[PDB]
Amino acid sequence: DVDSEAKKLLGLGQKHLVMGDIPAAVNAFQEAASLLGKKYGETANECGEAFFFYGKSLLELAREEEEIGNLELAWDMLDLAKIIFKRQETKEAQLYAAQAHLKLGEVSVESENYVQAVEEFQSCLNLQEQYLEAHDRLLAETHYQLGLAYGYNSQYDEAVAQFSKSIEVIENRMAVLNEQVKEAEGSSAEYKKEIEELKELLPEIREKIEDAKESQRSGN
Amino acid sequence: DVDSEAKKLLGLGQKHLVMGDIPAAVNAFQEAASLLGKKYGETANECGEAFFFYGKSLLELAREEEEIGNLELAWDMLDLAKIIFKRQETKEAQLYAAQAHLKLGEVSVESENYVQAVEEFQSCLNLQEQYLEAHDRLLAETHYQLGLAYGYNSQYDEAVAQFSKSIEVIENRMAVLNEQVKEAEGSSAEYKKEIEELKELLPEIREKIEDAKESQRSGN
């Protein structure tokens, strides 16, 4: 009924970013976020994934005018999605909440408020650093975003600090990624060798049956 | 003490097959299997891995003479290792017991007794087919060994049957192996792309610090 016709509208807006047709991506999330709100309430867990993407789109859509108008709403939405995500004890529910703070600080940057950006980016880095690997790509992406906000607020000692931490993750990641390429191409070699030898003993088995059924006829 | 000086002798005999110097590989397992027997008994679980390799070597060593003598003992040993393995409820302990029956039937083949070979190979196939994948390489290797014994006993209908089953596994395996090469080289591509893009944003971050510390000096 509702959940059905709404889950349908979510798949659209995401492939509207795939399409890049943002203005229709917004109206895709508009109605979807409206239904779940009118049905389940402004805070029920059902509306987290919805309020997030709807807020996310308004930020992208916003790129003094109606741009300042859309930021105000995009904030309110992501705040809700944050509140909706944070309260649930789930690694997935938390990283979503981290993602709320992330875009929450991106909206702060767009609105020239950098102190808040520093706060929301800090909030998001905090959460991610409980669940994710130290070499996770996201730690790098937030450290950088945070170091940008620090820089906009001309706290260069701390902006340099975050750029360092973001490089420290990016390097330590490519290390893992290289190690994973070795093991990937290494196992690809093991698998390929077995095939190239599995291939070369079916001849033996056929010339075993060739020579077997021939002995069955000869006995007759 | 004993377990220490014996576990040492096991590592030798295995790298004596790596060396291919079988006659010294036998005396490597001889003493090792003797110590654990004299300490723990002719059936204690400690002596399974030992009695197996010692039996395994005597079979290889045996390739009417002292060859017939070594087969008699190689049998007795692998029988024990079988008894020692089978009684333990462990996927690993069972596949070892399957391996006992396997070499147990190989010894039967070498001794011109094919009916027993058929039995011991059948015993081993039975066990493996509980734990292993249907595309496991071992199912193929036993089906073949069994079809050989069936052939030596000129039951060609059943020898052809086993060669078929062994081909059916070997083909269905290369299918998996091919599928695993795809995913291996596929993931190798994902990992390699991330590196080639992780590499190309450290420039951005350095020219972010370059441009950052320069603003710190300019303020001063």
Author numbering:
A (entry chain A), B (entry chain A): 38 to 100, 169 to 325
What does the paper say about this structure?
NASP is a major histone chaperone for H3–H4 dimers critical for preventing histone degradation. NASP and its homologues share an atypical tetratricopeptide repeat (TPR) domain. They constitute the SHNi-TPR (Sim3-Hif1-NASP interrupted TPR) family, predicted to have four TPR motifs with the TPR2 motif being interrupted by a long acidic region, a capping helix region immediately following the TPR4 motif, and a disordered C-terminal region containing a nuclear localization signal (NLS). Here, we report the crystal structures of the sNASP dimer, the complex of sNASP with an H3 α3 peptide, and the sNASP–H3–H4–ASF1b co-chaperone complex.
To facilitate crystallization, we made a construct containing the TPR domain and capping helix region of human sNASP with the acidic region deleted (a.a 30–340 with a deletion Δ101–159; hereafter referred to as ‘sNASP core’, sNASPc). During gel-filtration purification, sNASPc was shown to have two peaks (conformations) on the chromatogram. The two protomers in the structure are related by a 2-fold symmetric axis with each protomer containing four TPR motifs. The extended α89 is constituted of residues from Tyr261 to Gly324 (64-residues long) of sNASPc with a kink at Glu305, and the kinked α89 helix is totally about 95 Å (65 Å + 30 Å) in length. The α89 and α89′ twist one another in a left-handed manner to form an antiparallel coiled-coil like structure, with the C-terminal one third of α89′of the sNASPc’ protomer further packing against α7 and the N-terminal one third of α89 of the sNASPc protomer, and vice versa. Thus, the C-terminal one third of the α89 and α89′ helices each function like a ‘capping helix’, forming the unique architecture of a domain-swapping and dumbbell-shape dimer. The coiled-coil like interactions between α89 and α89′ constitute of totally 66 residues (33 residues from each helix), of which the predominant interactions are hydrophobic interactions and van der Waals contacts, with a few hydrogen bonds and salt bridges further stabilizing the dimer. Consistent with the extensive interactions, many different mutants with single or even double mutations along the dimer interface failed to disrupt the dimer, and only a mutant with substitutions of six hydrophobic residues by glutamate (V265E I272E L282E V286E I300E L307E; Hereafter referred to as 6E mutant) was found to abolish the dimer formation. The purified sNASPc dimer at a concentration of 5 mg/ml was crystallized in 0.2 M Calcium acetate, 0.1 M HEPES, pH 7.5, 40% v/v PEG 400, with the sitting-drop vapor-diffusion method at 20°C. The concentration of PEG 400 in the mother liquor was high enough to serve as cryoprotectant, thus all crystals were directly flash frozen in liquid nitrogen.
